Design a protein around this ligand. Structure first.
Ligand SMILES: c1ccc2c(c1)[nH]c1ccccc12
Ligand SMILES: c1ccc2c(c1)[nH]c1ccccc12
Ligand SMILES: c1ccc2c(c1)[nH]c1ccccc12
Ligand code: FES
Ligand code: FES
Ligand code: FES
Ligand code: FES
Ligand code: FES
Ligand SMILES: [Fe+2]
Ligand SMILES: [Fe+2]
Ligand SMILES: [Fe+2]
Lengths: 384, 103, 384, 388, 107
């Protein structure tokens, strides 16, 4: 597998998840924004450890594996698209069609028997809400809705976001995001103060284990996720004490937000409402390789017309993006990086000492282990 | 002080049974051979339920990280567990199984 | 088990020593100078592979492992000492007491069952001669004297020195300093001329194996080390010849220095007298990880009054440190690094071709192998 | 030996070649030019993973392993040649003779019993055509001619070249050079236009491969190699088509070059004629370690007198070196680097999908597997091991 | 001085080693393999170890320092890292007494 068998045997509750160091194969993943790739201008990227090339031909997106079948070089070292529908390797000129990856010509040996008998791996690509999703999997893809949080694809939902590469395994990003008690790191958030938001330091759980979360095994669209319900019977903590004496307090804002938090396979978090009562935040932690992920952030707001979308776009660039996506979430970034060492040798998955609020994370680990569509392995990446 | 867990007939040798207590933490009852033992149900190393683990002899293995505890003494039997498990009074009275407070 | 078993089996004379790549556990080690850590200003450091935290509370030093029990992050990423007796992890606010490492509070959930049931690892800390010694070990710590070189803790001994990080395994440093013939590398030193010192190109054997090397394992103070009586039994070589022709000469000076040298566990060398007939140099080779060590060097001159200090300090700071510790010992630094490659794969321990002068070193390997208080492994560093 | 048996089992036709990650031991290899090593000025280098030292004494070259027998440090960290015929380790002063590597003295202990009873490994070295060759092997070396391509040593052949360190395994370089279709990467080289060359986008296989590929294992001097007779048996592809439409054409210059290419053990390519009709190019891909090689380039031109040799030296510097060795081959450098990832874990040798133009390369792999004089291993580098 | 008296043949048990110190010279090691006696230099040619402090298995002496080994009869290396042969000294038993040559064999 991807992890020492001795460790996998130990984590009987969620071995597939611990083994999924490279992410889950056979799911859709957003990797860039539509306006980032123009007609006839191939773009490179790495997803689930695989180097890919994406091109826009006649407005439509196509995805080919960035690895020549011949000597395994990346075609992108020197891109040569000699006809609108093909790409020619810069080394010995093996030429492939973007449409189906078939080897259709070899400039240096036009009559080779390999022509029409070899095919470069291709992956489905779909655009939605200005986002570019790639189905990193085999066979016919399921509807995109299965791998997106509820409402993301709503007709009136206006989506704007930001994307960047963060140095941590995708799972550490997922868990931090869905961690009920991690809000402690945001106690000094400027956003919280300026937007007058109510933000406790944490929650004293109430009720039984089962009431702490709400697991969704299937919307009519087949999505799988978990809602964090620690606040349904829990007591929000606003005064932090040590030895019985107050040493810290939470935010007593009047605006109540983020009362709806859910994590969905393949790894996208939905926080609603946030950062404002009329908005929603959806963020993906896309696996690039075992040590890196794309932190694909998006903010949604229902807009009924071109005027509202224009206004939203304005507040996004001037306020939400800088104050929320960057200001508030920047703390999440270094928090993720801080867990790298403990989990790097895979030992942290055994030595971690969890407490009550981690019930949410446990539910996610079990959901992911039970309903993922496949474990990406090194064999998929290279493999002989 | 005791409370009927179940009939000694209900539990087959080598099986585990979770015991919920009103306004109290859950307990786990294990039957090793023909004798009964009881400890807290929650693993001391985390938040897992030992009643969902694997019992081998008098040693219960946690389903989360593989830690283990001796069901008789409640002492750790395998890492990452290091904090002793609480053990409770168990006794069979007329075929029925009963458990009480922590010893 | 830090080394290939096939290698340990070959070195029946000192297998434990070869295996101690990460140093010996259960020994005191100097890590910094008392002057470097002020009141309420925690500091980080890595010792024997373990990330540690040291703080001074009411003048007393305390040491806690720098790894939260929860998700294993370093508390030092963002220090939060909310009360003078505790430190609060910046992630989910698990709070520990500096004196016993006990988890006493959790701001994010004051009702957690973990409170008062978990405990963060702590290590004994003791100051002496202006040095901070940490007992990287388990159980009751022995007196600091057991792991110190003779005359270091003399009431009148004014100990002064400096410290830095060197890129080489600690053992290479030990075997570079306790090498009678390596002084050849200092033949062009400044401390030699600018201090009219007498230093031969090297000290060769004269009496016999035992004769020159004196093993110590009967001392009542607990000490364990080896002496190499170069000045009392060794033979100085001032004229180096090739084919009978003299091509290099030693240093002729009146000042008689270094006639007594000993190495003591866990890894401290004593050069007496040095750098002056009235002085003594004590230097530790503290393991940080398998590739680096702290070069903790100290120069000490006896004193019996508040006077002769500002002088010895004005001296130590004006000529001794820049000429005896830096000007002279700097050659030792690159010599240590030059041996890294040969021993990096542990094969140098088998392929090295030793000669007469290495008789002392061999004694040290055997003693260190039979009197070390424990072998530090990756198991101590992480788990398993 | 150096590669997982699971991989070697999948390349049964040329397993030794795939196993030779560090190169072939017991062969001569050029490492620098004669003019680069002056009397009494020791130079360091790494060959087949071993650190070596070369010195010129009384005009003759000597090669010693750059690793003291004592504590294993490199003598070159601080070179100390106290007498014309010796070198003293800067650490404990163990002194060795360049002639036979014998430990002849120890300045720090003149009475040591090790003196005269230990010896540093030495390797044969010899100069030819202004190049310094080292026999990285054991025992008496074979004639240099065995490990050189045809004509390189001819009396009237004037040799001039350039050398540099490239970051790729030596075999990726070999297969980049001895490849008739890879010249597609050179279609825009300044050499093509500026030297009016006739150069197709690539040379495709002709009607009969048995005639295009010529395995040579019956050479009198014992050289072993493979010819890809592209000019007389191959097909020059000048019009590159996609879907039958011409998207790119080769160069229709008047100078006829590249009639034939050949690769020879231990790893030297000969391009004939190149880069001009009256010249030849000979280039070695010398193993430094598993990830690096010397790209030792030489251009040969028959010169019949001093006037011609001088004119050649001038044209080499003003035209051939910059226009050909750099202007043409510079693209081969990044091409080689581009193959590293795929072959990094040795899986590329199993996962590559070759085509007909690669048939001569496969013949080379088979020949190299059969006629190499030894597989260099990490044990040779650290110290051979054996139990009674 | 040509032959050095070592000890009585009975003094040594089969498979044991005895170090022979010589004033003004390097120590020798006498080995008893079964009923036969052999002698070599006592110092391992690979370093400064005493072969008499090593392990004798058959006619092969294993060095205690690095595990190198030699054949006590021929003096030739038997296991790495040893590469230099040991000097061999002739041994003779007369009157049930063991004698070892003062000068090593010339080969
Ligand atoms: C409370 C308020 C905001 C957030 C949260 C909990 N969890 C989050 C995860 C990602 C982004 C924002 C949030
Ligand atoms: C011999 C002579 C001097 C020294 C030595 C061995 N080892 C040393 C380490 C530090 C400073 C001086 C010395
Ligand atoms: C075909 C034609 C020319 C060349 C070649 C293959 N390989 C080469 C390597 C160096 C210089 C020229 C060439
Ligand atoms: S590597 Fe792409 S055509 Fe050869
Ligand atoms: S929660 Fe039981 S072993 Fe960790
Ligand atoms: S990682 Fe320190 S409190 Fe959670
Ligand atoms: S390392 Fe060369 S003499 Fe000691
Ligand atoms: S000293 Fe004998 S094997 Fe090295
Ligand atoms: Fe957050
Ligand atoms: Fe030194
Ligand atoms: Fe090329």
């Amino acid at each position: 597998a991807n992890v020492d068998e001795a460790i996998l045997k130990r984590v009987k509750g969620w071995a597939p998840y611990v083994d999924a160091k490279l992410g889950f194969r056979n799911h859709w993943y957003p990797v860039m924004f539509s306006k980032e790739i123009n007609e006839g201008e191939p773009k490179t990227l790495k997803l689930l450890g695989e180097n890919l090339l994406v091109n826009r031909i006649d407005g439509k997106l196509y995805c080919l594996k960035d690895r020549c079948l011949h000597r395994g070089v990346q075609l992108s070292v020197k891109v040569e698209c000699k006809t609108k529908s093909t790409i020619t390797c810069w080394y010995h000129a093996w030429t492939y069609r973007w449409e189906d990856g078939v080897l259709c010509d070899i400039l240096t040996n036009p009559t080779s028997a390999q022509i029409g008998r070899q095919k470069l791996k291709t992956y489905p690509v779909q655009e939605a809400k200005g986002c570019v999703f790639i189905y990193l999997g085999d066979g016919d893809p399921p509807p995109l809705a299965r791998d997106t949080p509820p409402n993301f694809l709503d007709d009136d939902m206006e989506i704007l976001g930001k994307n960047q590469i963060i140095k941590s395994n995708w799972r550490l990003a997922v868990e931090n995001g869905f961690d009920p008690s991690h809000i402690y790191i945001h106690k000094d958030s400027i956003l919280v103060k300026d937007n007058d938001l109510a933000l406790p330091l944490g929650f004293a759980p109430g009720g039984d284990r089962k009431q702490q979360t709400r697991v969704v095994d299937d919307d009519v669209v087949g999505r799988k996720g978990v809602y964090d319900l620690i606040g349904e019977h829990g007591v929000p903590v606003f005064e932090g004490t040590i030895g019985g004496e107050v040493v810290r307090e939470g935010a007593y804002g009047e605006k109540i937000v983020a009362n709806d938090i859910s994590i969905w396979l393949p790894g996208v978090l939905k926080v609603n409402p946030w950062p404002n009562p009329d908005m929603m935040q959806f963020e993906w932690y896309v696996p690039i390789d075992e040590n890196t992920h794309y932190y694909f952030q998006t903010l949604g707001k229902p807009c009924a017309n071109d005027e509202e979308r224009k206004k939203y776009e304005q507040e996004f660039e001037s306020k939400w993006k800088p104050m929320a996506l960057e200001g508030f979430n920047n703390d999440d970034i270094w928090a993720r990086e801080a867990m790298v060492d403990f989990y790097a040798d895979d030992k942290g998955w055994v030595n971690e000492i969890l407490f009550e609020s981690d019930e949410a994370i446990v539910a996610w680990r079990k959901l992911a282990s039970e309903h993922n569509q496949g474990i990406q392995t090194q064999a998929h990446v290279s493999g002989l | 002080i005791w409370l009927k867990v179940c009939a000694a007939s209900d539990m087959q040798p080598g099986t585990i049974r979770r015991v919920n207590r009103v306004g109290a933490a859950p307990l786990a009852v294990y039957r090793v051979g023909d004798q009964f033992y009881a400890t807290e149900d929650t693993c001391t190393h985390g938040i897992a339920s030992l009643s969902e683990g694997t019992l081998d002899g008098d040693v219960i293995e946690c389903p989360f990280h593989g830690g283990a505890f001796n069901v008789c003494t409640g002492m750790p039997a395998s890492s990452p567990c290091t904090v002793p498990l609480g053990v409770f009074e168990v006794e069979v009275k007329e075929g029925e199984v009963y458990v009480a407070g922590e010893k």
